[PDB]
Amino acid sequence: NVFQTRAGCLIGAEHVNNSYECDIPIGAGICASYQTSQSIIAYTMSLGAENSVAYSNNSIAIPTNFTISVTTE
Amino acid sequence: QKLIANQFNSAIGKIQDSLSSTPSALGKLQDVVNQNAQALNTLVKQLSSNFGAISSVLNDILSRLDPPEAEVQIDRLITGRLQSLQTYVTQQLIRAAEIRASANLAATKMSECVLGQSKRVDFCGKGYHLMSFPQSAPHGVVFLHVTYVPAQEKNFTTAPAICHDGKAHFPREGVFVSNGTHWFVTQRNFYEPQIITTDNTFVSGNCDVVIGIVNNTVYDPLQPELDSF
Amino acid sequence: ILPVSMTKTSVDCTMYICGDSTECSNLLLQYGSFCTQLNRALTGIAVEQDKNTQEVFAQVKQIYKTPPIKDFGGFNFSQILPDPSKPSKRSPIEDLLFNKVTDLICAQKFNGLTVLPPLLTDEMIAQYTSALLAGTITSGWTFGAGPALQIPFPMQMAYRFNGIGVTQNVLYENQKLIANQFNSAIGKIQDSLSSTPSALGKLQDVVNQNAQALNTLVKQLSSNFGAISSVLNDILSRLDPPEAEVQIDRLITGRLQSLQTYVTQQLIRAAEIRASANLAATKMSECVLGQSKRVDFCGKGYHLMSFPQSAPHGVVFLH
Ligand SMILES: *[C@@H]1O[C@H](CO)[C@@H](O)[C@H](O)[C@H]1NC(C)=O
Ligand SMILES: *[C@@H]1O[C@H](CO)[C@@H](O)[C@H](O)[C@H]1NC(C)=O
Ligand SMILES: *[C@@H]1O[C@H](CO)[C@@H](O)[C@H](O)[C@H]1NC(C)=O
Ligand SMILES: *[C@@H]1O[C@H](CO)[C@@H](O)[C@H](O)[C@H]1NC(C)=O
């Protein structure tokens, strides 16, 4: 399977029309992954979950609980 | 406090599991060590290259060529070996500058994240920074950034101020919120509703200059003492 | 204005030093692991610049959107929010920054000089910028430290006034004046970038230095370095293999070291851009995702709040 990326010709990876988090970075917004009989797919990067914050001129969101998260660096 | 301690202990245990389940969690350290060995490996492997001379081994050139006739071949290896060593030193200087920048960042994080509590957002981990705990790691440091992440939000109808007696009341600290019918004042970062008093709010002039104000009662704390009298 | 990314160039000795010259090729492999090292050095830079962009802009895993009706108590973000009309979903300021930064890269590309495209193409870099903008207006300083909690933008600004020691009543009385000052200041930024082009010099210099180093790396193949000629098929067509061996070698060591210097300059340049990208990432974390008390960090004055803007190979903060 032949796909034409702006980074070059990609052979062996089918070009799906979906969008996922970048698994293997190809370039020019295209990232490849191993997903569904499973194959290697080449998609456009999904920058994140599409969500609009319910903004309003008289609406505020205030947390009621919390999480003490210990990240590592 | 009990919930916070339980969340803290669970988060620390998850850090142990995350580092255990994910060995690559330390790629930033392993890469540095790998880079060093690779440069050292490259520096050793150059001595197996003759750089245009007859052979890489010097005893070989000196045991089968004449001293003034092996002169040029000796020099070719000297140029190539010293240029290869010049490259390695320059790479090490590049990489030492990178590590020095990372070490300065680590020293800064230790000064601010550990020895204090930094308001610098996303500096000491993602969230509102509480504290940090350093950990010695091979040729590096691992910070456990204990952060306060708000979790369960709730939409409230808010208001910039409260016009009680023809004069605007603004929250002394926090915001004004309403559960739909009653108005409360609460902290910005945690829903703790409080009755709007003159102690939770200050006053600034009349109440027709701020846009978005809503008429509501500001409960004067000492008025019930008037009723007692 | 802060440089963030750099042109992801990638050399190939066995075509740069000499193409269609097998005798040079095995002479190269006699030199050893110089060139597997150089491709390693430059792919290390190329991954680094992909990671520079990924850490300045991808501070959010959620792509936020402003409400379709854009009222914010009087603040006009139309000059920084992306245009739904233009094909490129960039703000007029972003468009202005792009038109103020200037095929020539293909020229060096012809000479064994690949220019890998950045992983985050400029339209998705703009999406991060739009996401950071939409989060900063709708949520404020909160979406960068957990969930995106909506808040009236004037209420958020009123808080940011409270952050600098100015009680929020000052805003609510002067909200119309603040909004007018805000919109006027944004408009002046548009004019300032339009009128003064050198404004983006910090970005243009980076691009210029990239091309200059690439330009120099191409002008070196036109130098014989002390050999009979600079062209290799010339030396191979008018000298013997055991005789051209020395002249071929002279061009190899000369071209190889010129490659060494360019890689060293790129490593210096990548380190400088790494420092600027870390500074840009820090400013995005503190100036944008929060409100920093660090004096003169997020602009001259008491920092209220900031706006990122994607620019070619960099980011522009409106403080
Ligand atoms: C309130 O918040 C919820 C969850 O984010 C959202 O789905 C809902 O539409 C919001 N409603 C209003 C009126 O803001
Ligand atoms: C609002 O909250 C108060 C408790 O502080 C409660 O008594 C009242 O019934 C609530 N009204 C609503 C549902 O808005
Ligand atoms: C916000 O806008 C609505 C109209 O959409 C208006 O009815 C309401 O009173 C306003 N509240 C404010 C100013 O917060
Ligand atoms: C509050 O009272 C005023 C009169 O003092 C009235 O004009 C207004 O509509 C009322 N509503 C508000 C501002 O909450």
Ligand SMILES: *[C@@H]1O[C@H](CO)[C@@H](O)[C@H](O)[C@H]1NC(C)=O
């Ligand atoms: C901002 O002002 C421009 C005119 O300069 C206008 O076209 C646009 O609709 C305004 N947008 C907002 C959000 O007020």
